[PDB]
Amino acid sequence: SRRARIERRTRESDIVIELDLDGTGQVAVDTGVPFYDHMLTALGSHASFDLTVRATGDVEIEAHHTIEDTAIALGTALGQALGDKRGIRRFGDAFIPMDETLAHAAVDLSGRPYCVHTGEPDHLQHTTIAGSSVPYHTVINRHVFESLAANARIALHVRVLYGRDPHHITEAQYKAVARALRQAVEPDPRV
Amino acid sequence: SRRARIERRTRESDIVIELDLDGTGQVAVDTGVPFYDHMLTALGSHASFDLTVRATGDVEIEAHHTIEDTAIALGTALGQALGDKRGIRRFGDAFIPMDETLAHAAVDLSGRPYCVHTGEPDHLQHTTIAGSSVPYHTVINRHVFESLAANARIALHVRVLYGRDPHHITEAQYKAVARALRQAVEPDPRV
Amino acid sequence: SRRARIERRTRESDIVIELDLDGTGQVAVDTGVPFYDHMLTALGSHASFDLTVRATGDVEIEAHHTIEDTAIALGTALGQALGDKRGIRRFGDAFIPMDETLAHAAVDLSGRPYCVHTGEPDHLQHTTIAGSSVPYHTVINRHVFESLAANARIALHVRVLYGRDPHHITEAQYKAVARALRQAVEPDPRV
Amino acid sequence: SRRARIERRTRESDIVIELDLDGTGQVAVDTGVPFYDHMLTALGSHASFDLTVRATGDVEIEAHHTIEDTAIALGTALGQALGDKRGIRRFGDAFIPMDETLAHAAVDLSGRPYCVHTGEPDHLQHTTIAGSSVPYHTVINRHVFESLAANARIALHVRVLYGRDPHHITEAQYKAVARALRQAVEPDPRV
Amino acid sequence: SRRARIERRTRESDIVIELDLDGTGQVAVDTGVPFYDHMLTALGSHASFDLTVRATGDVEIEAHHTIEDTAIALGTALGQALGDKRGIRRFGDAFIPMDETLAHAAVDLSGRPYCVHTGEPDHLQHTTIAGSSVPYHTVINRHVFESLAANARIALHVRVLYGRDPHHITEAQYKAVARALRQAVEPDPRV
Amino acid sequence: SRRARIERRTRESDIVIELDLDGTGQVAVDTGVPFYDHMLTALGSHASFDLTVRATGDVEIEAHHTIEDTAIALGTALGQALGDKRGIRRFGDAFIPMDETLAHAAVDLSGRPYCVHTGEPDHLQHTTIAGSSVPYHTVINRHVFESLAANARIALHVRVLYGRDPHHITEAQYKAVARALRQAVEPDPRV
Ligand SMILES: [Cl-]
Ligand SMILES: [Cl-]
Ligand SMILES: [Mn+2]
Ligand SMILES: [Mn+2]
Ligand SMILES: [Mn+2]
Ligand SMILES: [Mn+2]
Ligand SMILES: [Mn+2]
Ligand SMILES: [Mn+2]
Ligand SMILES: [Mn+2]
Ligand SMILES: [Mn+2]
Ligand SMILES: [Mn+2]
Ligand SMILES: [Mn+2]
Ligand SMILES: [Mn+2]
Ligand SMILES: [Mn+2]
Fold first, then answer.
1. Best CA proximity match to A100, nearest among C91, E47, B149
2. Which DSSP string corresponds to D60-95?
3. Where in the cell is it found (chains A, B, C, D, E, F) (predicted)?
4. B175 strand-pairing partners
5. Residue D46, SS3?
């Protein structure tokens, strides 16, 4: 049984995560930042996790605090669910083509906490993805991966080999992390 | 059953493709362009497809029309054989070292049709691979991958990381696409 | 049964290798160069080999002759244990994140002998990893991979995508080769 | 007696080599690639070998497979004929002026397998030498020397110091290798 | 008879050299700097000298004084053994391929004392070759050749055409000098 | 018997050459240009020719016409003495260190007439070597080698790898040509 429930209450936000590593992509995310919900839903489904996330935070300011607190809580949940990490593949990686974009992630689940994020086009440091609700500033992508890695205590390397559309670039990175985690957490039939 | 038969008659060529995705590399290719036959035989074998290709076309002009019509027909056959794509891995990638050459392909079988082809040395835009029959102009490699992707309705990213010999560079790309497809079409035991 | 015992006596060194490709990471290495023992222990464990290496050589001069003779003997053992290579995956690759470092290896076990080694920072051509015993000059990393590839008769491509610490860069490369071999030697259930 | 007969049958080609290192330039080559036959005839004569080569292969594709299989077989034959290499000069080198072209080769017959090929003008990566039969793509020159070195298990360094005409550049390299081998295989009256 | 015995006692070291130019590579070297012993053993063997070197010096400081005093003594011995230089080839040169490295030496035994040393990679000015004993700083290679040339009273030109590994670069230079001397000291049947 | 006598009378000069290829360096040169006499004496001795040259010409103008007519006559004599060139080494090369200067020459005696002259420092296009008699303009060095090659009907490649002193650079080139010819004209015991 590789399950965790994390509750995180801060001045800024209130988070509940229910995570099962050995799921079928049963995923429900509600953070009040709908593009983020879309990215964490993609992450949960492509990782074949069962994942519920419920977060409420200070989105009057902007999404940053809620996004960061959610990624910290989600990282904590991944680390707790992995437990002793005995008998798992440990290493995982995935390429994700998305139209013009190619992204990649590699993970070491028994590595010390580390995040390297490279290749993201410079326009993603000031791009906003905006709809009818709270917008998502793509500059936070790096912060999400750093927060996940630091709190799950894993080595996570995210690369954008190339791309143009900020939605494609962002979504391909979340999916790549997801498929890299899925491979790494898998039981290893020889180890 | 993941099988397709495509017949394609144009002004320029007459093509028959019989494709089974769940094969053992039973492959027979005859297009009248022998280097192309070698590349599609490699593609069929390394993908563990069963594949018959019979093509006759206007090779008095050059191989281009026959090569393009064959890749369109083969793309159509791959898309038809994949059907609803339910329960498959969806994503696949492969590195192919071939002496001095390293090539890579990544695929998303449920992605919208897209092809990105990068890293091929500039001399491949005017190289000919010639023997005793109809020659193969390596400039067509990009056209083959674009045609396959557009007609199978998949995202296909082909990269040459480095290399020198045009036969090694070309063959490593066809093989990389082949092994990437093989992984992507595989049943996914969790999805 | 995919096992080899290689004995190699030269003017410079005396080597015994016992290798089983179908192991559980039962690994014992003693060469008189303790950082090398650490790298070959990582290679044996991450490849899920059973591996014993016993080497004595002219370390009064430096580690080079012992290191090279061991990699030649180990390459010979890998080639002999693979035998006819019937029914195996053939192709393998692995990414290894190690803190700030990302390394990659790709292999073709039925390729002609070839080694390409790229991306290693320039400071690794004159770095020493020194403890209380015989030191390890990181310039030899390339020589180890070339020797393994040439004597196993395989295509081996080792890349450092980025990194800083010479111990991380070296160890991530040995591990990447190890996991690439593990995937390549695996029985292929379709071929 | 320093003689070898090598038979090599692959999917692509059928090769027979009869080699005597202590010959008088009695040479007969037939591969179905007439410029290659000319180069291997030059190599056999200038090395003062007796050499017969009979090769049939898939020249409908192009010369590459036949050329590579022949150089592998010829390398194997050179290594087998050299046997223990006791009492030979070991080291050999030769300069070959050919009109505007100067080429050089150096060999170490007891060196580990290694090939360095430098100085060839960039136009030789896409040049064809074509007559009334199967053409010869000069990009393969490097591949021939690498194949010979890897299968004879020798160190072979081929340089083009300068030149223009692709036939002169190619022929001067084959001749330089030939005269370098002739010096290296010679009995050494002091060793 | 082309023999010399040189005894050299300085504040720093005590050297005995026994040299025969007309030897069979009967070589014994002991200087307390084991990589240097390896290089002078290679020099003695490849020159087909009979050579004994016994040196003890101030290796608590570093190898430099012992290395320099030995090369001065060895140069003196070569000059004394050559005597009047009547009837010898006078000129000699040798290429030495060593894996990735190519080195060359040319000599004029009746030239005025002169040494030109070129092409050595810049990392060799601060590289150490270290084992379990006294290390060898490759910056001294130039000093060794200058000392040999100045004390034998010969013109000696040492070149590194290319290379990477400091052990290969150093050893190929000592061997090249050795084979160049062997050719130059040979009786000339026409002069 | 490999001997020639050439008499050449032009408007500008009167030349007699007596050449024996199979000599012992019995050499006598008198052209009225004493530095040229020194260079042709070096060429004759180092080639182990027997050579007499007697030339009188229009040195009131400068040495050029006498120097060129002598090199044409000497080239003619070399070609006539070589006769059918049956059973000779054919190829020859030599490195000549001269203090700071290194020069090289390579020859093919059965090559079509060709001369390539490279590496000479730019100051040699306007340097004069002057004593108490008719001076020698080093710009003529290229012209001498071109004239020799064109009239002997040989391929001759002369290189200066480096140097400073115009007397050393010039003399090392004449000597290098000389030793290259000596090797090339030698009977070949296997051909
Ligand atoms: Cl990559
Ligand atoms: Cl050179
Ligand atoms: Mn923050
Ligand atoms: Mn989306
Ligand atoms: Mn088209
Ligand atoms: Mn092929
Ligand atoms: Mn080595
Ligand atoms: Mn470590
Ligand atoms: Mn090939
Ligand atoms: Mn020719
Ligand atoms: Mn000193
Ligand atoms: Mn050594
Ligand atoms: Mn003129
Ligand atoms: Mn002089």
1. B149
2. TT-SHHHHHHHHHHHHHHHHHHHTT-TTB--EEEEE
3. Cytoplasm
4. none
5. helix
3-class DSSP state of E189: coil
> What is the secondary structure of F137-149 as a DSSP string?
ETTHHHHHHHHHH
In contact, D35 and D174? CB cutoff 8 Å: no
Which residues, 6 or more positions from C132, have their beta carbon under 8 angstroms from its beta carbon? none
Classified as helix, coil or strand, C138 is coil
Q: CA-nearest residue of chain D to B164?
A: D125
Inter-axis angle of helices E140-152 and E64-82, nearest 10: 30
Q: Which CB contacts under 8 angstroms, 24+ apart, belong to B20-23?
A: B20/B49, B20/B50, B20/B51, B20/B81, B21/B49, B21/B78, B21/B81, B21/B82, B21/B185, B23/B48, B23/B49, B23/B50, B23/B51
- Measure the CA–CA gap between C139 and A34, rounded to whole angstroms: 51
Testing the interface with F: which of D20, D24, D45, D95 to mutate, by most F Cβ within 10 A?
Answer: D95
* Cα F170 to chain centroid, rounded: 11
Distance from chain centroid for Cα E76: 12
Q: For residues F52 and F29, give the distance between their C-alpha atoms in angstroms, rounded to a whole number.
A: 6
Q: Give the length of chain C.
A: 191
Residue type, D165: D
Contacts 24+ apart (CB under 8 A), D120-128: D120/D160, D120/D169, D120/D173, D121/D160, D121/D163, D121/D164, D121/D169, D123/D166, D124/D166, D124/D169, D124/D170, D125/B123, D125/B164, D126/B123, D126/B126, D126/B127, D126/B166, D127/D166, D128/B128, D128/B130
d(CA F74, CA D178): 31
Backbone phi, then psi, for B11, in 5-degree steps? Answer: -55, -35
The answer to whether A80 and A6 have CB atoms below 8 angstroms apart is: yes
Angle D44-D47-D49 (CA atoms, 0-180°, nearest 5)? 60
Sheet with D155-162, side-by-side order of all strands: D91-98, D101-108, D155-162, D114-118
Q: If you measure CA to CA, which chain D residue comes closest to E22?
A: D190
What are the structure tokens assigned to C186, written together?
């695996």
Q: Which residues are placed with Cβ below 5 angstroms of ligand 13, an ion?
A: F 68
In Å, how far are B127, C145, E78, F90 from B144, measured between CA atoms?
16, 35, 68, 52
Q: How was this structure determined?
A: X-ray
- Tell me how crowded residue F84 is: count the other CB atoms within 10 A of its CB: 6
Buried b (16+ CB within 10 A) or exposed e, F54-77: bbebbbeeebbbbbbbbbbbbbbb
Contact yes or no for D155/D108 (Cβ under 8 A)? yes
Gaps after residue numbers in chain C (C–N over 2.5 angstroms): none
Question: If interface means Cβ-Cβ distance under 8 Å, which residues of chain C face chain E?
Answer: 58-64, 125-126, 128, 130, 133-135, 137, 139-140, 142-143, 146
- DSSP, residue by residue, D147-185: HHHHHHT-EEEEEEEE---HHHHHHHHHHHHHHHHHHHH
Are the C-beta atoms of residues B158 and B111 closer than 8 Å to each other? no
> Is residue A48 helix, strand or coil?
coil
Q: How far is CA A156 from CA A78, A93, A145, B173, D86, in A?
A: 13, 10, 8, 28, 55
What are B115's two structure tokens?
Answer: 């092809």
CB contacts < 8 A, B to D, total 50
How far is residue C82's CA from residue C1's CA, in Å, rounded to a whole number?
10
Question: How many other β-carbons are positioned within 10 Å of the β-carbon of residue C115?
Answer: 19
- Does residue A161 contact residue A93 with C-beta atoms inside 8 Å? no
Looking at the DSSP bridge assignments, the partners of residue F119 are none
What residues have their beta carbon closer than 5 A to ion ligand 6? B 171
Contact assessment for residue B179 and residue B47, using Cβ atoms and an 8 Å cutoff: yes
Distance from the alpha carbon of residue B143 to the mean position of ligand 5, in angstroms = 7
* Total Cβ atoms within 10 A of residue B154: 27
